[PDB]
């Protein structure tokens, strides 16, 4: 019901690439909460646009002087530059950065701050475009994003790994029943799991895929490192056993079935077939419950609380 307004009246949305490619300002500020970062998004975006980032974290006087010198140099000849955790240098931001922004054509500067941190100065913040980086909440949208970011078995295992990452990132945002604490699995875990899958498929040319090894390594080493409690490890192992069971038929979603690749295909047609079988999937309204294999009570309570909060806030908003 909440997404009905967005999907009915509004026909477009902008990601970070769209807002950085359609803004006249040379300065951008991205805010993110604790235990989430968006630096890799900037790295991939700069790689796509064929430009070099100068990552300059703040917090020390030497880094402040280096940032001043690099800002002057990049205003002289060009090039991008990025500032990490600018709230650690509040005095520098208040004086030098404010004076510089207040006072080239291929020069853009990105600043990353924390939403729960100290208050940034209003005159600086209003003079720069603002982006908020959050993980995409939809499951199928997350699968599509992870697939579009990217023998045939490597591609198929990448597809299954993207599905597993989307499932676990969807499950990790349900506090009392999905897990025990607030675990957040960033892109580094996905990259490490993909490297492990490539290494396993490279060292095993017999095509007898050791799915037990992949299951244990993913559920214990890669995605199980941050897991602290025993029951969270058990549920991660259950999810990895459901996804990486290694069978010809694999119904990870009650409406999506992935046939295993055959021994006569190439990577291009395999990627096309997997994209085609991903495109036909229609996400139901109960995809937060049926896809994650959870009882309806917890999902219903969470959705009801979210709906009550958003409706009360917009009712308080509309009256004035």
């Amino acid at each position: 019901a909440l997404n009905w307004f967005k999907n009915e009246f509004f026909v477009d949305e902008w990601n970070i690439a769209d807002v950085v490619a359609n803004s006249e300002n040379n300065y951008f500020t991205m805010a993110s909460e604790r235990d989430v970062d968006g630096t890799f998004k900037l790295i991939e975006l700069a790689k796509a646009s064929k430009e070099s980032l100068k990552i300059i974290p703040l917090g020390s006087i030497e880094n402040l002087n280096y940032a001043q010198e690099e800002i002057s140099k990049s205003k002289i000849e060009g090039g991008w530059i990025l500032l990490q955790n600018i709230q650690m240098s509040l005095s520098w931001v208040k004086t030098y950065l404010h004076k510089h922004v207040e006072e080239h054509e291929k020069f853009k500067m990105f600043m990353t701050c924390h939403l729960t941190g100290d208050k940034l100065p209003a005159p600086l913040l209003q003079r720069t475009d603002r982006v908020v980086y959050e993980d995409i909440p939809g499951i199928l949208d997350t699968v599509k994003d992870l697939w579009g970011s990217q023998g045939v078995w490597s591609v198929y295992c990448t597809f299954l790994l993207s599905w597993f990452h989307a499932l676990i990132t969807a499950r990790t945002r349900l506090v009392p029943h999905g897990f025990s604490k607030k675990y957040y699995f960033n892109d580094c875990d996905f990259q490490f799991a993909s490297v492990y899958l490539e290494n396993v498929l490279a060292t095993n040319s017999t095509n007898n895929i050791p799915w037990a090894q992949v299951r244990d390594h993913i559920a214990t080493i890669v995605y199980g490192g941050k897991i602290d409690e025993e029951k969270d490890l058990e549920v991660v192992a259950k999810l990895c056993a459901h996804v990486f069971c290694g069978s010809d038929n694999l119904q990870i979603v009650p409406g999506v079935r992935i046939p295993q690749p055959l021994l006569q295909q190439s990577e291009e047609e395999e990627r096309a077939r997997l994209t085609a079988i991903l495109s036909n999937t229609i996400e139901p309204a109960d995809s937060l419950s049926s896809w994650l294999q959870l009882p309806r009570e917890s999902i219903l309570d969470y959705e009801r609380l979210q709906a009550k909060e958003v409706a009360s806030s917009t009712e308080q908003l509309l009256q004035e």
Binding site: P57, S60, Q84, V200, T203, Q213, T220
Partner: protein, 1490 residues
Amino acid sequence: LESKLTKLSEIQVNWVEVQFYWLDLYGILGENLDIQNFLPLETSKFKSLTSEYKMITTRAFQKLTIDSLKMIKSSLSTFLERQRRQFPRFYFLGNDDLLKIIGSGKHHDQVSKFMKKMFGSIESIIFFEDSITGVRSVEGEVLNLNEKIELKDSIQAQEWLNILDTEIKLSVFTQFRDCLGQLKDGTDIEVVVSKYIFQAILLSAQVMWTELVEKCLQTNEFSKYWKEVDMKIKGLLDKLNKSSDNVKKKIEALLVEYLHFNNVIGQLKNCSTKEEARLLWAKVQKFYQKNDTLDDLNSVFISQSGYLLQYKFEYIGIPERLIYTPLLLVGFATLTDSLHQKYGGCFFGPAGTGKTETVKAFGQNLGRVVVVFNCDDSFDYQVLSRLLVGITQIGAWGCFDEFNRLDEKVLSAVSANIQQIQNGLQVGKSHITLLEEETPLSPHTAVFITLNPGYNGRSELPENLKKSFREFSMKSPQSGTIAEMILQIMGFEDSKSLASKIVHFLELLSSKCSSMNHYHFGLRTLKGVLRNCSPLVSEFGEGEKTVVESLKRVILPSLGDTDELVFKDELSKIFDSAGTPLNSKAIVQCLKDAGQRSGFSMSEEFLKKCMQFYYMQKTQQALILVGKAGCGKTATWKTVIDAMAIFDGHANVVYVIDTKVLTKESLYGSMLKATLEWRDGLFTSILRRVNDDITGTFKNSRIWVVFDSDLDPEYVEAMNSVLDDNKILTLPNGERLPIPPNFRILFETDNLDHTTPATITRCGLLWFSTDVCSISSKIDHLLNKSYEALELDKLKDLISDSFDMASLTNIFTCSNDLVHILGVRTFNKLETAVQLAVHLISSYRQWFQNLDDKSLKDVITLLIKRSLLYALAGDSTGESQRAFIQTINTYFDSQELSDYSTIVILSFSSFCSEIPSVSLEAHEVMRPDIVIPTIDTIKHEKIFYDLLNSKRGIILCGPPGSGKTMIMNNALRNSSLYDVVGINFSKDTTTEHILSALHRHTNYVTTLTLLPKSDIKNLVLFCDEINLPKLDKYGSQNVVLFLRQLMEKQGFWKTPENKWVTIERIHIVGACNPPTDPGRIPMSERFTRHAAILYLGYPSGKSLSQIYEIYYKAIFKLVPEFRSYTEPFARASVHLYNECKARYSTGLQSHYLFSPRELTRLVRGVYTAINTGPRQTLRSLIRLWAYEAWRIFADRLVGVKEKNSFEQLLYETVDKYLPLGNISSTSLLFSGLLSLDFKEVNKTDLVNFIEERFKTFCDEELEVPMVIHESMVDHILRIDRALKQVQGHMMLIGASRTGKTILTRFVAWLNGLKIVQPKIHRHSNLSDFDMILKKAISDCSLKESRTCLIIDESNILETAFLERMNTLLANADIPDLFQGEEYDKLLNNLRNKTRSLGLLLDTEQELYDWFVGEIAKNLHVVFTICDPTNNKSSAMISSPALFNRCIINWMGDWDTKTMSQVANNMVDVVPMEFTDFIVPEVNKELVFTE
């Protein structure tokens, strides 16, 4: 000639240091060729230093040189940087060790001393005829090099160090290859274990194991290999008993490895299918070997989970091998996964779970020594990046233990460097840039972090740093497996059941005990109980008695009262029986002998605690002593060290370091950013002196370091690498100080609320449940100590017989029912009683030779009763004091001690005959030292002087204005034995202020010793408002702990030079308010233990009437016609003060605090108005007193309701006591501007005069169009009255633009003062305020210029400005301003001014007193506060010195009358009446004007 010997020793130490520095300088530049041409200026400086050294040597054979050497040490810093660039491992050495290692041109023996700091696993080098043939590990194991290294005199250090480093790898690879060939030949390992080194046998055994497991995995059987491994393990177990110590350690570690092998084989055998067997085999580490690698050192690679790592072939010696738990294997797997992509491995979880040891075990399996670093708050960006650039070049694995300890800014700053090293390792870059320098990057390097999340006072890692690390949880280790394999290796007959019983017992002890903070029973205490059961096998044997005895000796001292019973019940019900206890005859005899030597008493509890401490210190290096304040911890460890020194014959040195009195930079050390050099702290200097052994006196003598303060995590936790198994100290500059086995650390505190479980499990814990000493034993020991500090035998016998214990215990029980300020237990009060009684007996002993036995007994009993009263009930109210003296009189034929009984010169008398007549004149009221004596005043004087003559600390406490400084100064003014220095404390006071206030009163003489400047008089250190110094975030006070250290230990530690001083003739007297007063904080009992506490209540109403009628008689000696009116004025003033204190309380406003200070100020104001005035009638005198009461009492009132209430109170008081027109504030106008005398004046004439004066001031100084009004006339009259006084200061509080600074400037111009407004602005520091105050003080004193200082509220940038102003107003000068060279220049200028004026003043004290008098006379300060709600203004108002000196004049907002007057007077000059107006019909209350 003790001073001569000390001077000779100091000169010899300085000469030895200078000789070592010159030897290093000659080694680096003076001897070697082709090295002076690098820096020609430094070469010339070295030549000049050589000439100076040669001249000094010739003069000595037949200071300044050291200073010149230190000056040219800066020019050698970049040379040392290049030298460290030459050999990467020099980054682990300090500057002095680098100088020693370069200067060893031909001796080559200095290398082995620092090689342990360099490599980390080698303690010495075997030398044979100018060649290297062997290398010796830390554990004593010897490795013989493959080829003998030739040595020449011309070659310098780093070339042969590099070839030795390569030769170590070649030798260990050669031994590994030979051992592997021998094992492949088919021989057993029992003959190979006695030939090659341990790393070679471990690696060959692992390679053989993985090869045979692969061969068996090709098939599907495991029984035969399991049986063979079992026979090998049993053979090693049988061989362990018949081998030497080194072979025992080697066989133990091989047993660890083979037990892991058998565990893996057993896991594989019980497996069902082939796929699960392949899974279990892929999960565990495998040690392969390339058969096509031509390179020798890269022929061994380690495979796990499909990834590969390269063996480094570094010598590791004999490490304590970790038991291969499944958690350890999963940790190895995730470390391999992190290291495959050149990331950084990370571990998080609760403390004591095996993270740093896991990293070290992984490094040892990879055959390299993991360098461990203990992160600290002092690690800024430069230090951390220098450590990173030092571990890049070496290639060793850096483990940053406790990574959360870093500041969050540094965590964000080092993220760029960590990403850079990761990218350089990934892309195979050769050179990376850090600190704007390009450095080589060894491809073997890595970084590890082991943080401890979830504890307070720790930062949280930012995401950009956490994304560069791979973290793994380590919440729960496996205690059962560790205990089982360790007990199997030790040779215990029963291993599995015993380990299960130990783990079950530990779990039951954790679950079934009181859940306080310091009960942690994790892995660390299991390792401790196993290590304590290790050496008990020689006396108890392998079995169950050994483990129950070790469990007792490890856990029991840390248990409480009921937890001990629970522990005993559990131990009796889970284990079969308790073995035969230790005889312990010699040690208990030594404890008894030491106690008899020190005068203590052996009770059951004290002896039990001593035995427990000795047994738990026999194997645990660090001990924490906890319990109640004054329980007996210090006595316990002192007597057990004395007994242990007697028993073992080893001399013992103790360093008692107070942790919280020193900052962290003073304790561990600080780096000077202006030169990037390292300055040693205190603990680091002590450890370096112990390690270096210049004189070799610490070879066989133990060292104890006692941290006698609270356990601050930010202080103690920085020694985490010291306390644990690492036993190393990691300095920020890179120095690694090893901890010797005999070096032990003690902790002494009372509360463990703020401590962390990380630093609790590291140290052994000893809890003091109850007091170790009985009460009567405490009297006995105190009496014996006081006697030793001093016929005598008869006096001692009768005094000891006087203390009847049966009455004493009931007296102590009845003492508990009274109310006590600064609540201290009666057990801690006996010091004052015993010391006071002994001092009185020793003082009156000179008259004890001329009286009978009964009179002697009666006098001594009365003195003991007086001492007991003033000790036990000396800090209670008057009624409680009367009740206690009645009780002690009841509980003791003996002479009765009344409420005012005393002894004069030897007859018992009272204070009624000791009250003298006072000839108080008129002019003597202004003198602050004039005190009118009463019974209470003279009694307090006698008891305070009595306590101070007994060499004890005194804490005078009472409500403000009780008279604490009054009684003290009046008692010490008539005595020529002590001097009083005035120190006032604020919310921000440091030890440096106390030391500065004593530098101009005391002398540093080396014999260090802080003797007073005078030689016949002691010095009294008066500290005022001890409550005011605030707590930190961890509930501790710097100043209070400094005072405790100065009282008990009789000294302190000098911060910059790190030498212990000893205080000799300084007594500490403290003044404070009760803790129930707002703004005050409680103080720890560890400070109030050492000092006597006295309650000083307010004088009674009739008493105050008596003193103030004496004052009024003194005043009215001027005017004799009103001599009969002194008593009504005293009664009226006392009633007025009582009514003001009762009605206007603190509940209405913050600054409604009244005191007898107000009455004294009223009397002094009445005196000034009488003296500077004409002949007064009765009505004029009444109006004068009413005006003085208005300007003293009602100035601080804020509300118009309060003003009207005070006016009607004044009317009521005048009508009641003094049978006169309006006496309102607007109707009383007393001023001396209109005449030559302080007479009452009218309104219009005063307004006209002030109009003319304001016009002249505007035309003379600056133009401001301000309109006179009646309220401003009253305000300017009271400001002029306040500034006319001697030592008169103001605090004008009111809204902005009411007119405060312009009014003060106009008053100062009227009185001829000089306005000095500080020009404090933005980006201004404390230094500019120092210069402003110093210039103002100099212009006030030297130039005799009357200076008025206006300090606006916006001119206080920091709280230190407020502290400086508080010091200025409390004393008369600033101790911090005039010190050293500035002090000498000030004294020279003061001497020149005194000679110019013509006074014959020559002594320092007289000149300083004249300076103080001049600055008090000629300086007045007027404050200005706009908003009294702000925190800075609230602290300014609530400050002790500012409130007790300034006359608070509340300007307030403009009332409607002032607004109407100024509006009429400023719009009367414009034509407003040009139109018709009809008068409206409005109410009287609605209209504000006429």
